[PDB]
Amino acid sequence: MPHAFKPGDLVFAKMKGYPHWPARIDDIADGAVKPPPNKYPIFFFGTHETAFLGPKDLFPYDKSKDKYGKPNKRKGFNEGLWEIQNNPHASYS
Numbered sequence: 001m002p003h004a005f006k007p008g009d010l011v012f013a014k015m016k017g018y019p020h021w022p023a024r025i026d027d028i029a030d031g032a033v034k035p036p037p038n039k040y041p042i043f044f045f046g047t048h049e050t051a052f053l054g055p056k057d058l059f060p061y062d063k064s065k066d067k068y069g070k071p072n073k074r075k076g077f078n079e080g081l082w083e084i085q086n087n088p089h090a091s092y093s
Contacts, residue, residue: 002060005025005040005055005058006025007025007026007027008024008025008027008089009024009025009060010022010023010024010060010061010062010084010088011023011024011025011042011058011059011060011061011064012058012059012061012064012065012068012069013042013044013051013057013058013059014057014058014059015051015053015057018074019072019074019077020059020064020067020068021044021045021046021047021077021080022044022045022046022061022069022077022081022083022084023042023043023044023045023080023084024043024045024084024088024089025040025041025042025043025058026041026042026043026050027041028041035052036052038054039052039053039054040052040053040054040055040058042058043092044076044080045076045079045080045081045083045084045088045092046075046076046077046078046079046080046082046083047076047080048076048092061084069081069085
C-alpha cells in the first residue's frame with residue numbers, strides 16, 4: 001500500500017497551463033525556506049525550477065509514465081524526461 005510522499009519520490013507534477021511534468025519531491029536544505037503546510041517542494045526536471053504543490057497535483061512516476069512520459073514541445077520538457085529516467089537523484093544546482 002502507498003505511503004505518504006517523501007523526499008526522493010519521482011512524480012509527474014501538474015500545474016495550470018502546463019502538461020504533467022517530470023519532477024521529484026526535494027529535500028529542504030538546512031537554512032532554506034520551508035513550504036506552506038500540506039505542501040511539498042517540487043523540483044521540476046529540465047527547467048530546474050521549484051514550486052510548492054499538494055498531493056492532488058502529484059502523480060507517482062512508475063504508475064503514470066506510460067501516459068505522461070512522451071516528448072512535448074515545451075521548453076525543458078524533453079531534457080526533463082532524460083533526467084528523471086537517467087539520473088533523477090543528482091545535483092542539478
